[PDB]
């Protein structure tokens, strides 16, 4: 499974006749971000959105690599001997430095707690739409009261669960626990 | 064709970049790769004929050619006459042989100048004996990690032995997890092992009447003797310059007062820091949390930071 | 990630000393092939090992 | 108490195992197998048009000159016979599709019963740990007696 | 309110659709895809068993690559444009495989999705295999709507 | 066609080359800081500023120099770059997201050749050191092709061999050369094949090389002295391919003679006598036994290798028919000698 | 149908800025997902640093939260009846607004 | 104690037996059977080329002289019909391959549950030998009473 | 008593489950499968 | 008697317990490669310090397990045990 | 394509490329894009 993921993305790079190559993504329209669907929102297709913006094919391949590394680590975990728990940790630590550090989210935001009348205001919605059509055409160079009450972007919860599952696996390795959290030592 | 084969083709192309062309570099390289395979097949052929498991089974008729076996043992000091059992550290298939193959290839990944150089970050690896005891006997990973930290701290601080290192960590204020009085932790745990729950000390009220209750706090809670000196000392606004430098060293106060520095310095969680500082983010706003507010207010004239702490209590219905 | 040995491990975890040196270098190569620690030698990464 | 906690963990393992089989009832593989059976039985209109077109082409003469003819006179009857023999294969293919999906339905109904057995058994062991906790309290009161 | 009963009536279906513009990769399956060709469906079937050796997977890939080569070397014979004038509507193409007793294929392109001197990639349909017994003379064959 | 691109190696050099592309033109002089380290005291992040100092002058006409920088942070903040050596600081109150600059008030770039401390006052501190002054202009007389085709190498240079010079750019500069004539007399053909190794390379004004790219044109020669490979079906049943003087058996007549062995069971099929079933000779010729003398240091030299050659079958040249090592005993070698 | 196309292009433009600015992606350096900074500047000047403020799942501030669903639901449903009517949503439930 | 040690050895036998079946899940024989099903369904591209080549050869005349012709005019339609009828056989063959590998997957999942039953049962008997060892110590103290 | 009431509810679940399977013995699907087998074997007079 | 006697392995070898720096030395590896290419061409007729630190050949472990499994089977036959080692006699 | 300049390109960043005097003397768009702070390299096939 690993060598077929590396046909799309080798995080270690590519060696072609004894020299490491310059590229990282083995598919050329992922290097050059090449949109090939001009109408992604005609229907509710997740693949049609990623054909329009092929960075999601990068994040898809990235998540399959993390799914592989956690699966190799879970398979080594369940072989509960000593040297295979070191193998389990190196598959888990390899998935962690692909993720990087878990992102810090500032808790104080511009979110006050508005009335439902104020958050669902039709003037707030029309100002939000007129502002984006202004930015989408670069024409300009009430405002601060309306657009404050917008909802905020959130991080991907599935992408967040990889940090949460890897932190729990490494926690169970650093203590003497199993993959379920049960103690291996006898009391 | 010597010594080329264990280099990559890119390494060999850099060395013979000025001398020869690409094609002349290409032809010497694949000849060295063929010679390396023929050295492995020649060495393996001698060593597999000389296996003592085969020479006692007379039916196989595997005739070991003695002319190669003589010349091999004259070069390698009877290597082909010395077979080991599985699990022997001497074996070419042992984990120590794997470690040797691994260390020889990986020590060149970074330059010797770099901080990521393998002998720079781990000086103990090159000196380690490939013995049967280092392969067999088990010890705690944590003790091997504490041994590695103590070696580097002894070398940095230029101290005699490990017990002088534990002396300076009993006194050292400018870290978040220090003062660590090692002999104190040894005392306060044995009391918690011998007297679980401190019931015997409270069944004998005359003995506990000797020690003041500020030191009886040091049994159940981890209050090292230097941490007692930290908590007890008096902070005026006169000595706060000098007494900052004793507690924090060379850290700037502006650099320390920000929440992400405190989160790493005291090793706090994101929730635990809001108990002290509060919800403070890197924008213009700042809010109450746990009915308190802590705001640095910069004097526009002097540049002096002035920290306010406002505490709220609702005397009426908070709903 | 720098000293190649885990200091947050509890004291009940046993290894041998050669096995810990193997796990240290196996950690180090996986940092280095991935360019997580910068400026690894491009010629050494291209080797057959 | 240790005896019942091993019985508790054994019933919990079955309850998780049959619950996992029940919830994920049809695999990706078992779904592909039904799709192939459905595709094999969808060919009957394309075989029929292909076989009627060949019957119409074999009724025209293909020998010309001083000898004429060569029309296969039984071409429509041969084509009708091939479509009927192929329709028998499609009806067996379609019945094997339906029988396979019914086998997976009855398999899931077994898994539902096996899950409800393990669920009722770990409710039983929970009530049996309550009973043992009261026995231990009586043995402590017998000690202080 | 058109999308009420499917999406907006429940928070679960609403949050599923609203996230799908932001995080499609949570919903992207490497196995299933809308618009997936019959080549990829036959590939998925060829690897839909438990024992996937490297040689089993390689042979499934070369079977895929054989059917890839067949639709890649289609020769366009003729076309038909459905509207009365070239700027709007669809053009329907006819392709020929590189076999004797050749096979015929059709695909369409949408002229409405021509934008800034270039067809968008979703203007094109797949090549669709024509199942009819076709034998033209000197490639005198034309589509028509 | 030679191509020069100025994008850095991914990491700090990619960010430092994006600043040069955005705020500079090709031919500007810069100070690229190669050593960028997180200050352990004044930082809470692992993030860095990526500074480049742009000189005033050369191509992008600036009255004053400016310190270009790139930051990975998104919050609005000021960027103070304090030089401890000159005891002054370049600042940018409310720096933009991504990359921005801090102009140099007093245009004195000698103060920027030492340690610079760039701070955010919000957790991002960077120890900026190792300054490298670079000149980004490219002479066409230093964009060059090196062709090693055999004996002496030929060097073609873009000042003489390019008709239309490319516009200066950090993105891409394409040097399309003319038809360059390479003398191929002197190619050493090894196994009827040679290579013309072509190396693209380029240099800037300060003398740093811009990189290289190596190509190889394989040249293979058709020999005319050899006969074609020929297939022979001999009357005795043998099929063979006649290469130069060699005859390689293509078929076998083992299954023709196996029928007699197989009439009486698997015991007779899988016996040693079945494995001694003989195959006919390959055409006209004979078998000859060559008894090789034992090894002797007096008459064979220090090396134990020996070779057998054949001559005056199809052509008067020599062809090896056996190669081996000398031993302490005799070696019996039975060979078919083609005629 | 031109306004429907412009509304889809506003959603794709807004989503493209917000998905590049995800802090989960900017710390994974191997993806090479280059966030174009010119759009990110102009977006945060209009929307007061909205693209720099990401929330965790389960936060009420989220555009995927039940309060965002409630906001979308109340904005569309409050116009179903006339303000004169007794079935008007703010008439029957004045506490919702 | 002897009664529980026979129960211990009986549960240990099942735990070894189902653990052996689980670990070695697919035999050498069961692997050969899937390989044959996969090979039988890989013939569809060679049958198609063989059947189209025969259609092209039967369209040329084979009677010459004062009578001409003999072209089988329905040869392409007959060849297309044979390929479709054979494609129905391949889809049933491919579905029987996938259904067989899914049967072996569900069989292994049964063996996993049967192993975990025997593993939980010999943990239960081990705890029940601990309980009997304490009963024997009470009976020894009752003897010395 | 609580132990036996869980045993009572477990046996009642099986009695309802197998009673439901017994009473509705052949599905609508299993009935369609037999009908197709019967129709496939009724073609022998039309083929002849 | 097809195996013959189990081979005796001498325990004192030329294996000292070297440093990892010494065992993974690049000069030791290059001398080992230059020595084999010398033997492979029979050309010749520092050395004793470098080539001592090489690892030693080991016997086949699978071939070794045949002696270990046969010794256990015969042990169970010579005593009154079963093939698992359980006593056939009743205590 | 030159970088964006408010002096010579106006306030809008859009640019378009057209072709003329291939098959008919009218103009046809062959590229449409936005101006950026750097140069843009555009390689197009020009029909004749």
Beta strands F173-175 and F2-4: pairing type? antiparallel
Closest CA of chain A from G66, distance in Å: 11
Q: Does A37 touch chain E (CB under 8 A)?
A: yes
Dist CA J28 CA J49 (whole Å)? 9
Selected residue of F40, F41, F191 to mutate for chain B interface (largest B Cβ count, 10 A): F41
C-alpha separations of G47 from A172, B123, F75, F113, F211 in Å: 43, 53, 14, 41, 45
| Closest C-alpha to C38, from E137, F34, H84 | F34
Helix (H, G, I), strand (E, B) or coil at F172: coil
Compute the distance between CA of residue B221 and CA of residue B215 in angstroms, rounded to an integer.
Answer: 10
Q: What is the DSSP secondary structure assignment for residue K4, as one 8-state letter?
A: P
Question: Taking CA atoms, what residue in H is nearest to D66?
Answer: H67
Q: Taking CB atoms and an 8 Å cut-off, how many pairs form between chains D and H?
A: 136
Cα–Cα distance measured from residue A17 to residue B13, given in angstroms and rounded to the nearest whole number: 12
DSSP bridge pairs for F285: F338
Nearest to J14 among B3, B78, B101 (CB): B78
Q: Are C25 and B102 in contact (CB under 8 A)?
A: yes
Give the tokens for residue F210.
């811009």
How many Å apart are CA F92 and CA J27, to the nearest integer? 56
From residue A31, alpha-carbon distances to A55, D113, F98, K31 in Å are: 10, 53, 21, 22
F–G: how many Cβ contacts below 8 A? 19
Burial degree of A110 (CB within 10 A; 0-12, 13-18, 19+): buried
Selection from B133, B98, A169 nearest residue C25 by Cα: B98
Q: CA-to-CA distance for F139 and B159, rounded, in angstroms? A: 59
Of I10, I30, I43, the CB nearest to D88: I43
State which residue of chain F sits closest to B115, comparing Cα positions: F37
Determine the straight-line distance between the first and last CA of chain C, rounded to whole angstroms: 22
- This entry's atomic model was obtained through cryo-EM
Chain G positions contacting chain F at CB under 8 Å are: 21, 26, 32, 37, 40-41, 44, 49, 51-52
Q: Which of H47, H37, H55 is nearest to H100 (CA)?
A: H37
Given in angstroms, what resolution was this structure solved at? Answer: 2.8
SS (H, E, C) G12-57: HHHHHHHHHCCHHHHCCCCCCCCCCHHHHHHHHHHHCCHHHCCECC
Write out chain E residues lying below 8 Å of D50, CB-based.
131, 133
Q: How far apart are CA D139 and CA E17, in angstroms?
A: 60
Listed residue (C41, I17, F335) closest to B116, CA to CA:
C41
Contacts of H123 (CB under 8 A, 6+ apart): D6, D9, D10
Residue entry with tokens 């007079």: I45
Question: Percent helix, strand and coil across chain I, each rounded to 5?
Answer: 80, 0, 20
Chain H residue nearest residue D42, CA to CA: H88
Interface contact A106-B9, CB threshold 8 A: no
- Report whether F38 contacts F48 (CB < 8 A): yes
Contact G52 F98 (CB under 8 A): no
* DSSP conformation class of E6: I
The Cα–Cα gap between E78 and E104 comes to 11
Q: What is the 3-state secondary structure (H, E, C) of D104-125?
A: HHHHHHHHHHHHHHHHHHHHHH
On the 0-12 / 13-18 / 19+ scale of CB atoms within 10 A, B115 is exposed
Do J43 and F304 lie within an 8 Å CB cutoff? no
Nearest residue to F173 (alpha-carbon basis) of F142, F208, F132, F134:
F142
Q: Give me the residue from A12, A90, A185 closest to C12, CB to CB.
A: A185
The DSSP bridge pattern shows strands F99-103 and E128-130 to be unpaired
A17 part of contact set with chain C, CB < 8 Å: no
Who among D85, D98, D126 is closest to I29 (CB)? Answer: D98
CA pair distance G29, A80, nearest whole angstrom: 33
CA F336 remoteness from chain centre: 46
Residue of F nearest to B262 (CA): F44
**D99: number of CA atoms within 13 Å, CB side?**
12
F5 in contact with K, Cβ within 8 Å = no
Which of B10, B145, B295 best tests the A interface by mutation, with the highest count of A CBs <10 A? B10
**CB-CB contact of E100 with H52 (8 Å):** yes
Q: Do F41 and B264 touch (CB under 8 A)?
A: no
Give the nearest chain E residue to A160 (CA atoms). E26
Chains linked to B by 3 or more Cβ pairs within 8 Å: A, C, F, J
Check CB contact of B274 with chain A, cutoff 8 Å: yes
The residues, ordered by sequence, that sit 6+ positions from G5 with a Cβ below 8 Å of its Cβ are none
| Residues of chain G contacting residue F97, judged by C-beta atoms under 8 Å apart | 37, 40-41, 44
Backbone phi, psi, residue H7, to 5°: -70, -35
Q: Are D123 and I6 in contact (CB under 8 A)?
A: yes
Q: Which residues pair with residue F332 across a beta bridge? A: F291
Whether the Cβ atoms of residue B181 and residue B225 lie closer than 8 Å to each other: yes
Residues 6+ apart with CB under 8 A from A51: A35, A36, A37, A40, E121, E122
Q: How far apart are CA H17 and CA F139, in angstroms?
A: 80
Cα A4 to its chain centre, rounded Å, is: 21
Query: Is the Cβ–Cβ distance between E73 and E95 less than 8 Å?
Result: no
């Amino acid at each position: 499974a690993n060598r077929w993921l590396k046909y799309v993305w080798s995080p270690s790079g590519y060696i072609v006749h004894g020299q490491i190559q310059n590229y990282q993504w083995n598919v050329r329209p992922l290097l050059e971000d090449t949109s090939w669907n001009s109408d992604p929102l005609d229907s509710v297709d997740p693949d049609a959105v990623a054909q329009h913006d092929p960075m999601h094919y990068k994040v898809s391949t990235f998540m399959r690599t993390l799914d592989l590394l956690i699966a190799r680590g879970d398979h080594a975990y369940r072989q509960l001997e000593r040297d295979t728990l070191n193998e389990a940790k190196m598959w888990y630590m390899q998935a962690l430095h692909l993720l990087g550090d878990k992102p810090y989210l500032p808790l104080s935001t511009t979110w006050s707690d508005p009335r439902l009348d104020r958050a669902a205001d039709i003037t707030t919605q029309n100002a939000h739409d007129s502002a984006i059509v202004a930015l989408r055409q670069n024409i300009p160079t009430r405002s601060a009261n309306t657009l404050t009450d917008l909802f905020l972007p959130q991080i991907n919860e599935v992408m967040m669960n990889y940090w949460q599952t890897l932190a729990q696996r490494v926690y169970n390795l650093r203590h003497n626990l199993s993959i379920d959290g049960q103690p291996l030592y006898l009391p | 064709l010597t010594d080329i084969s264990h280099s990559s083709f890119n390494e060999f192309r850099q060395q013979v970049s000025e001398h020869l062309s690409w094609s002349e570099t290409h032809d010497l390289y694949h000849d060295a790769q063929q010679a390396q395979k023929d050295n492995r097949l020649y060495e393996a052929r001698i060593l597999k004929r000389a296996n003592p498991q085969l020479q006692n089974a007379v039916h196989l008729a595997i005739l070991a050619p003695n002319a190669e076996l003589i010349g091999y043992n004259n070069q390698f000091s009877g290597r082909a006459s010395q077979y080991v059992a599985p699990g022997t550290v001497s074996s070419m298939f042992s984990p120590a042989a794997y470690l040797t193959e691994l260390y020889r290839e990986a020590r060149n990944l970074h330059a010797s100048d770099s901080v990521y150089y393998l002998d720079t970050r781990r000086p103990d690896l090159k000196s380690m004996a490939l013995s049967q005891q280092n392969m067999d006997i088990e010890l705690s990973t944590l003790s091997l990690s504490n041994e590695l930290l103590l070696e580097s701290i002894k070398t940095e601080s230029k101290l005699e032995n490990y017990t002088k290192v534990m002396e300076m960590l009993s006194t050292f204020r400018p870290s978040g997890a220090t003062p660590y009085h090692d002999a104190y932790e040894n005392v306060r745990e044995v009391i918690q092992l011998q007297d679980p729950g401190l019931e015997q000390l409270n069944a004998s009220p005359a003995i506990a009447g000797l020690m003041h209750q500020a030191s009886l706090l040091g049994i159940n809670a981890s209050i090292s003797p230097e941490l007692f000196n930290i908590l007890t000392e008096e902070i005026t606004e006169g000595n706060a310059e000098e007494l900052y430098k004793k507690n924090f060293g060379n850290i700037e106060p502006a650099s320390l007062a920000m929440p992400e520095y405190l989160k790493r310095y005291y090793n706090l969680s994101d929730e635990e820091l809001s108990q002290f500082i509060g919800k403070a983010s890197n924008f213009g706003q700042q809010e109450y949390s746990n009915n308190q507010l802590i705001t640095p207010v910069v004097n526009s004239s002097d540049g002096t930071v002035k920290v306010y702490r406002i505490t709220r209590e609702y005397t009426t219905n908070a709903y | 990630q720098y000293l190649l040995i885990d200091n947050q491990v509890s004291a009940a975890i046993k290894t041998t000393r050669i096995a810990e040196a193997i796990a240290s270098i196996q950690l180090y190569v996986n940092r280095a092939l991935e360019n997580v620690e910068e400026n690894a030698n491009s010629g050494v990464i291209s080797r057959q090992f | 108490k240790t005896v019942l906690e091993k019985s508790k963990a054994g019933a919990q393992s079955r309850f998780d195992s049959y619950g996992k089989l029940y919830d994920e009832n049809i695999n990706a593989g078992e779904n592909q197998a039904m799709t192939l059976r459905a595709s094999a039985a969808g060919l009957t209109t394309a075989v029929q048009a292909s076989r009627l077109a060949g019957a119409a082409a074999d009724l025209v003469p293909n020998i010309f000159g001083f000898a004429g003819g060569g029309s296969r006179w039984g071409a429509i009857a041969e084509a009708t016979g091939y479509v009927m023999e192929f329709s028998a294969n499609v009806m067996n293919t379609e019945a094997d599709k339906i029988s396979q999906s019914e086998t997976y339905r009855r398999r899931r109904q077994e898994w539902e019963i096996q899950r409800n057995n393990a669920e009722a058994e770990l409710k039983q062991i929970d009530a049996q740990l309550k009973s043992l906790a009261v026995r231990r309290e009586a043995a402590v009161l017998q000690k202080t007696s | 309110f058109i999308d009420w009963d499917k999406y907006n009536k429940r928070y679960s279906t609403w949050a599923g659709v609203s996230q799908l513009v932001y995080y499609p990769e949570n919903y992207i399956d490497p196995t299933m895809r809308i618009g997936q060709t019959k080549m990829m469906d036959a590939l998925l079937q060829s690897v839909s068993q438990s024992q996937l050796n490297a040689d089993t997977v390689e042979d499934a890939f070369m079977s895929y690559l054989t059917s890839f080569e067949q639709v890649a070397n289609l020769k366009v014979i003729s076309a038909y444009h459905d509207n009365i004038n070239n700027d709007q509507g669809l053009t329907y193409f006819i392709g020929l495989s590189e076999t004797d007793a050749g096979e015929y294929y059709w695909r369409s392109v949408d002229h409405s999705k021509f934008n800034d001197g270039k067809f968008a990639a979703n203007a094109w349909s797949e090549w669709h295999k024509i199942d009819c017994p076709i034998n033209p003379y000197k490639s005198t064959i034309r589509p028509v709507i | 066609k030679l191509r020069i691109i100025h994008n850095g190696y991914e990491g700090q050099k990619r960010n430092q080359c994006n600043l040069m592309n955005k705020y500079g033109k090709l031919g500007d002089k810069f100070i690229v800081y190669t050593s960028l380290g997180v200050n352990p005291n004044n930082s809470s992040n692992k993030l860095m500023f990526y500074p480049v100092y742009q000189y005033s002058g050369n191509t992008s006409g600036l009255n004053q120099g400016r310190l270009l920088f790139h930051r990975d942070t998104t919050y609005p903040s000021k960027v103070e770059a304090w030089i401890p050596g000159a005891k002054r600081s370049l600042t940018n109150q409310n720096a933009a997201i991504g990359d921005d600059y801090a102009t140099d008030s007093l245009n004195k770039p000698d103060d920027l050749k030492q340690y610079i401390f760039m701070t955010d006052s919000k957790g991002t501190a960077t120890d900026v050191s190792g300054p490298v002054e670079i000149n980004t202009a490219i002479s066409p007389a230093k964009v060059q092709i090196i062709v090693k085709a055999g004996g002496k190498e030929q060097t073609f240079t873009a000042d003489k061999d390019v008709s239309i010079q490319p516009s200066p750019s950090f993105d891409e500069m394409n040097y399309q050369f003319n038809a360059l004539e390479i003398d191929g007399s002197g190619l050493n053909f090894i196994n009827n094949s040679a290579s013309i190794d072509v190396t693209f390379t380029a240099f800037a004004e300060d003398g740093r090389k811009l990189g290289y790219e190596s190509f190889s044109i394989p040249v293979t020669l058709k020999v005319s002295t050899d006969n074609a490979l020929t297939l022979h079906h001999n009357e005795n049943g043998a099929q063979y391919m006649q290469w130069q003087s060699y005859r390689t058996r293509l078929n076998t007549l083992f299954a023709r003679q196996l029928v007699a062995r197989a009439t009486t069971g698997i015991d007779t099929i899988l016996s040693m006598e079945t494995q001694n079933i003989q195959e006919p000779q390959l055409g006209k010729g004979f078998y000859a036994t060559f008894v090789i003398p034992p090894y002797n240091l007096s008459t064979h030299g220090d090396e134990r290798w020996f070779k057998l050659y054949i001559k005056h079958v199809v052509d008067n040249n020599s062809h090896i028919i056996y190669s081996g090592q000398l031993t302490d005993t005799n070696i019996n070698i039975t060979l078919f000698i083609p005629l």
